[PDB]
Amino acid sequence: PKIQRTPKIQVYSRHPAENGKSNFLNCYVSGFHPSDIEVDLLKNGERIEKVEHSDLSFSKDWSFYLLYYTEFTPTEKDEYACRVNHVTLSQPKIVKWDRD
Amino acid sequence: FQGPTSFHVIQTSSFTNSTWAQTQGSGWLDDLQIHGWDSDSGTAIFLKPWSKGNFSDKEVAELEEIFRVYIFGFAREVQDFAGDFQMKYPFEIQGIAGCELHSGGAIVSFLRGALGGLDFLSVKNASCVPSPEGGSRAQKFCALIIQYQGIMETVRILLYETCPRYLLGVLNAGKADLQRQVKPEAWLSSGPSPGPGRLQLVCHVSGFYPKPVWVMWMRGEQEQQGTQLGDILPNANWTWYLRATLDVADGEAAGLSCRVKHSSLEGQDIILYWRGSGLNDI
Ligand SMILES: *[C@@H]1O[C@H](CO[C@@H]2O[C@@H](C)[C@@H](O)[C@@H](O)[C@@H]2O)[C@@H](O[C@@H]2O[C@H](CO)[C@@H](O[C@@H]3O[C@H](CO[C@H]4O[C@H](CO)[C@@H](O)[C@H](O)[C@@H]4O)[C@@H](O)[C@H](O[C@H]4O[C@H](CO)[C@@H](O)[C@H](O)[C@@H]4O)[C@@H]3O)[C@H](O)[C@H]2NC(C)=O)[C@H](O[C@@H]2O[C@@H](C)[C@@H](O)[C@@H](O)[C@@H]2O)[C@H]1NC(C)=O
Ligand SMILES: *[C@@H]1O[C@H](CO)[C@@H](O[C@@H]2O[C@H](CO)[C@@H](O[C@@H]3O[C@H](CO)[C@@H](O)[C@H](O[C@H]4O[C@H](CO)[C@@H](O)[C@H](O)[C@@H]4O)[C@@H]3O)[C@H](O)[C@H]2NC(C)=O)[C@H](O[C@H]2O[C@H](CO)[C@@H](O)[C@H](O)[C@@H]2O)[C@H]1NC(C)=O
Ligand SMILES: CCCCCCCC/C=C\CCCCCCCC(=O)O[C@@H](COC(=O)CCCCCCCCCCCCCCC)COP(=O)([O-])OCC[N+](C)(C)C
Ligand SMILES: *[C@@H]1O[C@H](CO[C@@H]2O[C@@H](C)[C@@H](O)[C@@H](O)[C@@H]2O)[C@@H](O[C@@H]2O[C@H](CO)[C@@H](O)[C@H](O)[C@H]2NC(C)=O)[C@H](O[C@@H]2O[C@@H](C)[C@@H](O)[C@@H](O)[C@@H]2O)[C@H]1NC(C)=O
Ligand SMILES: [Cl-]
Ligand SMILES: [Cl-]
Ligand SMILES: [Cl-]
Ligand SMILES: [Cl-]
Ligand SMILES: [Cl-]
Ligand SMILES: [Cl-]
Ligand SMILES: [Cl-]
Ligand code: NA
């Protein structure tokens, strides 16, 4: 009942990134325990307003996982990230999307 | 047939303190969600038009009420017994129960429980089996719960008599979505450099359904054993995403290709060719 597990965070696009073409940004957060968690998608460091997410699930080892996603249109200069807060983290963890 | 072969419900019950607990629940075919639980109403959310399988509205409503009473009573009893079981808050209990169709046609049922992210109990042969990770607490729990007349019998009926017919009914009822074929798209990119003088190449495969898929880095007809398969990741709307990487020396990237096979492609593989010197995307 006592060891907690910190979230793994993976950020990826639904389709290959083409600047100016609409796409979907995914953040998959997994391997964590306990279940309470805060997940935001960022554009240029700012929180994106309309993000969808899956209902809570867990893997066979009892670690929880969630998918957060939103429409986005990649550009050459804009940045996107996934920001996660969890009891195992003293500060929010930010993982940036990187098409390369 | 392709697609999921199992059905299960899950429970996550989070006990903040002695007077506040909340439960989330849902129903699943493998990793595809088909039922939600609405705590506002104590009823289920049917995510697909076929989510009730071949069950009548009346039987579905009886099962929803079983779950509603169980969810409330589970929290009530855990909170009443938490002192005797020397529980420290906060803590979190998980459960999964369901059944699955195997090769040869047998349907096997299962029920597993966890406390603090560790196995606590399972049901084997309609009996409560404490897990070693659960210690004496799990032994104490199993001896207490089996004395609950009705609970033992209701769990037996649900696992061994209700679930198998529900599973077959819903696999049939949902076959238009569960056995559909969705073609992947694929593309190449750089990966993080593994170190001095080396490159990582990435073959991305996205949007395929069902989940089985084959991806390999190739030199002509020679499969590269160094190919590293990532973990399969979800997309929204029931498709999957996968990265296959290869770490190579700088001067050995030329000549590489990525080949993708999938059930939806009817034998017409996708082949992508890596080109060096920044010529990789017209
Ligand atoms: C939801 O669907 C379930 C699955 O239906 C089948 O599969 C789907 C995909 C479609 O193809 C359907 O057309 C198809 O029926 C239903 O459950 C199944 O119901 C049938 C009855 O319709 C039942 O068949 C009976 O089986 C017994 C033997 O069962 C024992 O032994 C087998 C191994 O041999 C074992 O697997 C079982 O677990 C049992 O231990 C047999 O005695 C029956 O024979 C009698 O009836 C037949 C005609 O049906 C007649 O010719 C005979 O002469 C004799 O009178 C009959 O073959 C399946 O076993 C059962 N499958 C499962 C996994 O339970 C489900 O039906 C409902 O529940 C059933 C248990 C039964 O009470 C039905 O009356 C109910 O409507 C259906 N609906 C719901 C609400 O769940
Ligand atoms: C899969 O599940 C089967 C169905 O429950 C189970 O069979 C049951 O096994 C029970 C023993 O574990 C047995 O209980 C006994 O019942 C008799 C009266 O019929 C009773 O005298 C006896 O009481 C004594 O023992 C108790 C502790 O076991 C004790 O508390 C009590 O005070 C007293 O000292 C005992 O309760 C059931 O009768 C039996 N039921 C059926 C329908 O078979 C399987 O386990 C056993 O299976 C066979 C019986 O077919 C036996 O050879 C073995 O005992 C098996 O362990 C179970 N399978 C497995 C692998 O465990
Ligand atoms: C369309 C989709 C269909 C889905 C298909 C189905 C697939 C689902 C597969 C499997 C589903 C498994 C269901 C779990 C709940 C069943 C028990 C229950 O609900 O009882 C009642 C709650 O009774 C209570 O309020 C007590 C709650 C304390 C819980 C203790 C933990 C039990 C863990 C288990 C440890 C295992 C121990 C060993 C087990 C051998 C519910 O209310 P009721 O029905 O009105 O009253 C029944 C009265 N009775 C309880 C006296 C009977
Ligand atoms: C028991 O825990 C309750 C709920 O905690 C809230 O939800 C959890 C999921 C977790 O995220 C937690 O941090 C949340 O705070 C407490 O109720 C909360 O109390 C606090 C502050 O006192 C208040 O911020 C929350 O709004 C409230 N949650 C509710 C009401 O949904 C219990 O605290 C008591 O209830 C308060 C309303 C207040 O009367 C206070 O005096 C009580 O202590 C927790 N109780 C105990 C014994 O600690
Ligand atoms: Cl950012
Ligand atoms: Cl397990
Ligand atoms: Cl509820
Ligand atoms: Cl104890
Ligand atoms: Cl029942
Ligand atoms: Cl490409
Ligand atoms: Cl080899
Ligand atoms: Na109390």
Residue numbers in the entry:
A (entry chain B): 1 to 100
B (entry chain A): 4 to 285
Q: What do the study authors state?
A:
Although the four types of human CD1 antigen-presenting molecules (CD1a, CD1b, CD1c, CD1d) are related in structure, CD1b has distinct cellular and immunological functions. As compared to other human CD1 proteins, CD1b shows particularly strong recycling through the most acidic endosomes, use of a particularly capacious cleft to capture large lipids, and it is uniquely expressed on a subset of activated macrophages in the periphery. After identifying a distinct pattern whereby T-cells respond broadly to phospholipids in preference to sphingolipids, we solve the basis of this response via a ternary crystal structure of a CD1b–phosphatidylcholine–TCR complex.
To characterize the extent of antigen and TCR remodeling during BC8B TCR docking, we determined the crystal structures of the CD1b-PC complex to 1.7 Å and the unliganded BC8B TCR to 2.0 Å. CD1b presents several abundant-cellular phospholipids, including PG24, PC, PS, PE, and PI.
